[PDB]
Design a binder for this molecule. Structure first.
Ligand code: PRO
Ligand code: PRO
Lengths: 334, 337, 337, 334
């Protein structure tokens, strides 16, 4: 691309040790569910207030290399008139943009999906770049079952990610490739390992067929864990299976892997990331975080209303930011 | 994947291929029909777009030659001048309304101007709304070119799987999908090369359709005929027939009921003669060989029409000629003109 | 890829599918024919292997029912008791000699007992030597199973591409390749499942054959009929016919001249009745539907034969019955027995 | 496999810094061409003598983690009655075994090949393991042209390597996967980079579909170079394009990459390897050597006859061994 050098610089930067990505890219719908989750009306006034609370948290932006925004938020102003994107860039945080248009179910499968949003994506990306966005997000969802994920599901999601990745790079956004394997079910960690290995290898083959510049991409995978209905397992076990799965599939050329939290609690996500960064083994990428819920849940709770609870919630948000920052360095302690 | 429309998809796809009938492609965009409308000094206003299509559809004796008409979005909701909805006009004559659903092409990075086709986003809800509007089949055009290194494996793959996913969403919402992998004529290659490329592309298309669990008996194919490139010597209909049918024999399952050829670069008479010769070829052909012609059905009608509505009756005479000729061509019974 | 044998491959593959004829599969290994020879208390010596095959080939009135006989290596160079080379015996009656060329199956690591087929190494020189010996077609058996997660994508791929490479080497050396993706009956699945799996496998096979540039008009297909699993209720011939032919309609190009069904688990009468019903089904079938039967042609002949050569004439009577019945079956003209 | 742990240990060992692989696996035919190349009759007496000269070279076996043998040589004795395989194991060198049965041309391509040898390979491998072999070699050949390598050539060679790899591991031999892209032609280094990237990515996708244990494999690729008819280029340029190509395609899980020399002279091979080991960049595998001709050519010349020329040729063989050893550490100087 004409953006090759800037894609490569920004993707490397996202992976800076001690930093990760906040996912604040919840739709008007999803952020509603979260806003109701603590008895708050889903009005733009409140959507604005929640995101502003996060971004004006005293020690927080230094812990973040990136923030994923929803379209609305990319053009939104803080209360003092400052555009959020300026607020982010002042602190050295790259603004990112969710570009996928949700999932739809594949006929002839058992509730497996493919992700939409290729239509007019190049012109959207260009407009987002002009607005200050420098990376993009697109989520593919795959499930684990008797015959899942199917060859059709894998293929659709891999090549859908690969085509999205190309359009992103043509328009100056570093694509986060996010093939999330859902944790839901009763499978063991070994099964999650095999499936994760299969999916990533299909994804990197797809990315190669599409001539994607790997040094200008990011990966946002699931950690390798037992299913949501299976026994929890220690961080050192998650670490060992996750890192081995990535060693088997993700080229060195990729600069950074920013884990999604999935089912995990705030503390579990942090402890799991931390253990991966304590593992003495070849890891030719930054292992960092791209958390929404695992970074925000305690902050939403403390907040609820406003005023006295802003300062206490900003304290709570800083705790999680600083903990995950520590986790990227293998230096988190309880 | 059974669709809830399986029975109606199968019946309608079979119907399109009724011997003695074919498809009029009147689905050209606001842009393309402009180029055609300017081509005879006519301003591209919806009043004129409406008038051209009305002229075609109200041609006495024409609709009986047509199993289907592909419409552009605008035309699907358009009324004739007398207040008759075009879709009603079509259904009264037994013609199935169809709908172009693709959203154009875009270039693939890292290739030499090869394209992929857009339009999967929100296609299911569009298809459903089109079904409610009277449409019973759909069209999506993938474009492939012939070159030194073309079509590339990436171009083939993107277009095949894009067609396959489109085909599924169509069937889920009750539209028979026309699968249209057009290989463009541009270049200096011979007919043998066009044969090899067409064989490669169709085989990739039917593999993709299988991986997507598409009901083949509820689909249609709209391929290019096999021809020499645009810069090469034109060749007789018997030769086009022999290479085209052999290419289809090698790739298109019997389960597919009808193959409705696109005209592409061809003149009206050349298209008809080519189709006719395919239906005179004594060989296993487990599908109807018919037509889905835009240019090759409309060119002489646009010429005689020109502008004012006292050229209408002479142009409707000219449109009937081409309809009747192509009808004859589906039966191997066309006798020159 | 044009072979220097293209014309002869096309003629011979077409011939195999002559209405009223089919293939005897007498290509069972030294091991398998042992199991059959023990099955009636006969020592597996080459003298007896020779005697069984001689009995078949010298059956008065049998060879006219056969377009082809598949031979094992040993049998291709064997002489009858009167000094007549079997291959000459076959060619005098217009029967093409064929040759099994695969070297058995081996299990795939990381699967649940799925196999891939061996024999590509040195196959071209073997094929050439077999052609020189009088063979004009070849056989290679891939085995796929139906299970919870079977057949796996790896099993399909390995067997499809193994068939495709084999097919090419065959054609380069003048043998029409019989492509034989046998899906085994074992299990409790219903006929619908067998249909879906058979559709998947054949589509992968024809994709592989296309990628390898195989001349389809110079190939044959030897698939399983579509049936319920071995543990499920047997079903009427009309039902086998309808699911089998639909599966073939969805996958096998018209360019393929003949589909010669393997018998698999089926009894003699069941095989014949099943084939017969397929030829009574009024539908697009752009290939000969015929037979390539081993077990289903030989079982009752082995029984009446048993041992000593005064059971020969009664067994040759029994072999003629099955030959004539299957011949009738290719024409849809079998009338029970 | 039942050999998983030993495959992983031996593959890691081949990549020991300061060591590489001698390819002495020339057929009765090929070693003839080499033996005639210096006016020597191709008799077993002489075949025996040449290999013995190499293996009894004073400082040489310590420079080698592996020696690839032909079948004949695996059972051959030295002149003093010592089995070569014992001679190798005493010095800590793993015996390896060429298992492919040559190439054949693919119909409908322009002289592209596929490699034979899957038939009865498991029983061969088992017998070779029993004989002391602990790794295996199989060579796929791909060419660069207008339409080459073709999708058919890539596929056949990738999946042929993947199936060979599996059988090897089932029987305790670490498979060297060798997709050599021939240097022949007028293409530039950028073209060789693109083709090498395409081929390796197809190979690792094939290996994943076949469930190959990557930690128990080796890769033997071409270095990335301009074609044989193009201008030679400096080692630092070969290094930069080669390593980038490997970063884009070869998983970290693979322990070692042992380069084939291809067209290169003895000194050019060494200088090129050396430069790759001087490159400061993520390289999650050993970069070492698997040289036949680039290790042997000067030794064959000095030798010719025997006697006075043995000791001078052993001096010449030690020079090349020590130089390539230095090259694996980035410590070679002229
Ligand atoms: O897996 C994740 O990271 C998503 C983001 C929003 C909450 N959970
Ligand atoms: O590329 C190589 O390493 C081969 C081995 C023998 C000489 N040349």
């Amino acid at each position: 691309s004409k953006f090759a050098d800037e894609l490569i610089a920004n993707a490397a930067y996202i992976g800076t040790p001690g930093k990760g990505i906040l996912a604040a890219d919840e739709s008007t719908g999803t952020i509603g569910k979260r806003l109701a989750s603590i008895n708050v009306e889903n009005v733009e006034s409140n959507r604005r207030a929640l995101r502003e609370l996060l971004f004006t948290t005293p020690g927080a932006l230094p812990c973040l290399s990136g923030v994923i925004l929803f379209e609305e938020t990319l053009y939104q102003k803080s209360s003092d008139g400052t555009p959020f994107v300026d607020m982010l860039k002042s602190a050295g945080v790259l603004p990112g943009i969710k570009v996928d248009k949700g999932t739809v179910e594949l006929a002839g499968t058992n509730g497996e999906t493919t992700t939409q949003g290729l239509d007019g994506l190049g012109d959207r990306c260009k407009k987002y770049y002009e607005a200050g966005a420098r990376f993009a997000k697109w989520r593919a969802v795959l499930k684990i079952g008797v015959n899942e994920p199917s060859q059709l599901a894998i293929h659709e999601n891999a090549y859908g990610l690969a085509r999205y990745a190309v359009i992103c790079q043509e328009n100056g956004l570093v694509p986060i490739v996010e093939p999330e394997i859902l944790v839901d079910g009763s499978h063991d960690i070994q099964k999650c390992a095999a499936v994760t290995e299969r999916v990533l290898a299909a994804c990197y083959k797809a990315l190669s067929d599409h001539h994607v510049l790997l040094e200008g991409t990011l990966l946002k995978p699931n950690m390798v864990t037992p299913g949501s209905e299976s026994a929890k397992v220690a961080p050192e076990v998650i670490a060992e299976h996750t890192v081995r799965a990535l060693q088997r599939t993700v080229p060195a050329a990729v600069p950074a892997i920013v884990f999604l939290s999935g089912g995990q609690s705030e503390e579990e996500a942090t402890r799991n990331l931390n253990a991966m960064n304590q593992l003495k083994t070849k890891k030719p990428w930054s292992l960092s975080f791209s958390f929404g819920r695992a970074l925000q849940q305690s902050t939403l709770k403390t907040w609820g209303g406003k005023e006295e609870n802003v300062k206490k919630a900003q304290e709570a948000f800083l705790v999680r930011c600083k903990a995950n920052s520590e986790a990227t360095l293998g230096a988190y302690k309880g």
